[PDB]
Amino acid sequence: WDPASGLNMTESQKGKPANITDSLSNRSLIVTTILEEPYVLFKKSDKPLY
Amino acid sequence: CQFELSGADGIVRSSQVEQEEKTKPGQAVDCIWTIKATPKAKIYLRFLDYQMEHSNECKRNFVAVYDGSSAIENLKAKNDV
Ligand SMILES: *[C@@H]1O[C@H](CO)[C@@H](O)[C@H](O)[C@H]1NC(C)=O
């Protein structure tokens, strides 16, 4: 650390890495779906729904 | 890609780019439209046809409205307005 730069640390770049990436479907399933009309639908409004 | 469009009433032609500034379809394209009302006239807009099927999301494609003068200062919105 110095006055000119206060954001220097060896371990600033890495935080709690633990397991690399995530396990497949660790917290979320991988559900697949075909776009059939009266079964699945893109919501009516678009912009505040991304 | 800036064009003038003012008066009392009118319509911004969709994808009206092959006449103003004929941009080849391959590249990303974007344009802005400038409205000026009759003296002492605030403006109301109504969309007659809107479909951005290129993607639901807009990190690539979107349509937005700006109020005031044309700055990044205040997005009115990106329904009628
Ligand atoms: C801090 O500065 C050193 C020397 O340039 C650099 O090797 C290191 O990656 C930097 N770390 C941060 C957190 O900026």
Among B59, B41, B54, B52, which residue's Cα sits nearest to residue B14? B52
Among B24, B31, B22, B17, which residue's Cα sits nearest to residue B61? B31
Size of interface A-B (CB pairs under 8 A): 11
For ligand 1, mutation pick of A1, A2, A5, A8 (most atoms within 8 Å of CB): A8
Integer Cα distance of B35 and B5 in angstroms? 5
Cβ contact, residue pair A47, B57, below 8 Å: no
- Output the CA A16–ligand 1 centroid distance in Å: 19
Alpha-carbon distance values, A21 to A10, A11, A12, A17, A37 (Å): 21, 19, 19, 8, 35
What Å resolution does this PDB entry report?
A: 6.4
Taking a C-beta distance cutoff of 8 angstroms, is the pair B41, B9 a contact? no
- Output the CA A1–ligand 1 centroid distance in Å: 10
List CB contacts (< 8 A) between A46 and chain B: 52, 56
CA distance A50 to chain B (A): 5
Solved how?
A: cryo-EM
Residue found by looking up tokens 């220097």 in the block: A8
Structure tokens at B26: 């391959």
Contacts of B52 (CB under 8 A, 6+ apart): A46, B58, B61, B62, B63
Select the residue from B56, B62, B81 to test the A interface by mutation, using most A Cβ atoms within 10 A. Answer: B56
